[PDB]
């Protein structure tokens with residue numbers, strides 16, 4: 001039985017909570033509350049005879065209060081940095097979050113980059129090619145995801161579970 005704190009980071013409204021709720025609760029909503037606070041969810045996945053138990057922390061308010069972020073990712077063994085593929089600024093912001101984790105999070109943290117809202121590719125602003133090369137250059141797990149269609153949601157968390165010590 002392995003236990004790992006997993007956190008999500010990214011600009012407001014990229015779909016951090018939606019990804020958690022799809023993975024944990026098999027739910028998606030076009031409306032999602034964004035009220036300041038934190039939720040502690042748990043999700044256990046299995047790999048052979050190994051039980052990977054995620055402690056999933058999801059928070060609202062780190063966009064308003066960026067300097068409080070260290071309180072949130074401290075002790076995190078995994079992080080999902082999320083951007084919205086239809087918003088170039090969220091991708092730039094994701095890169096900042098990745099940089100911060102590299103400088104300030106545990107040195108062995110597993111970081112995945114999630115190109116979210118992939119179901120909205122009609123308005124794509126971030127090319128997968130570019131994000132892929134970025135992730136490769138930084139040794140990041142990377143997938144495009146959708147909380148709405150669940151595309152790659154199971155995949156991204158299983159990949160994290162596999163990459164963890």
Ligand SMILES: Nc1nc2c(ncn2[C@@H]2O[C@H](COP(=O)(O)OP(=O)(O)O)[C@@H](O)[C@H]2O)c(=O)[nH]1
Nearest residue numbers: 013014015016017018029030032117146147148
């Ligand atoms: N179409 C689509 N909408 C999404 C997706 N993920 C999140 N959203 C929407 O984006 C808005 C913000 O989502 P939320 O999970 O609260 O983002 P957060 O602030 O990062 O936690 C909500 O209206 C969601 O329904 C997705 O994969 N596809």
Ligand SMILES: [Mg+2]
Nearest residue numbers: 016017034060
């Ligand atoms: Mg949220």
